[PDB]
Amino acid sequence: PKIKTVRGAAKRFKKTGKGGFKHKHANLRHILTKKATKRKRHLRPKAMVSKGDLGLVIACLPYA
Template sequence: MPKIKTVRGAAKRFKKTASGGFKRKQSHLRHILTKKQLSVNVIYVINPWLRKQTKF
């Protein structure tokens, strides 16, 4: 059976944590940053129920 290829777009967006979860950054942070709060620089952990929908 052939190996499953990694989805390269997902590999660039998500990082695996030590406990087996995945973390991601906040979206919409490319331009017009003067109006956005500093609290958007938080790294989020993907919920386990959403991990089933996300294609890694």
């Protein structure tokens, strides 16, 4: 036994120069016909998991 890395997380989250994990925002791909640039451009700065939400990936990324 070794425990596996969870693909639910390892195709979603990445590691950075600060504690936690960095991810993209959603709601930017599917049907943009009613989405002005002020509702698209601002969905690219990325965000972190770092609170009680990190304890949900602590066994999903056991080797990150």
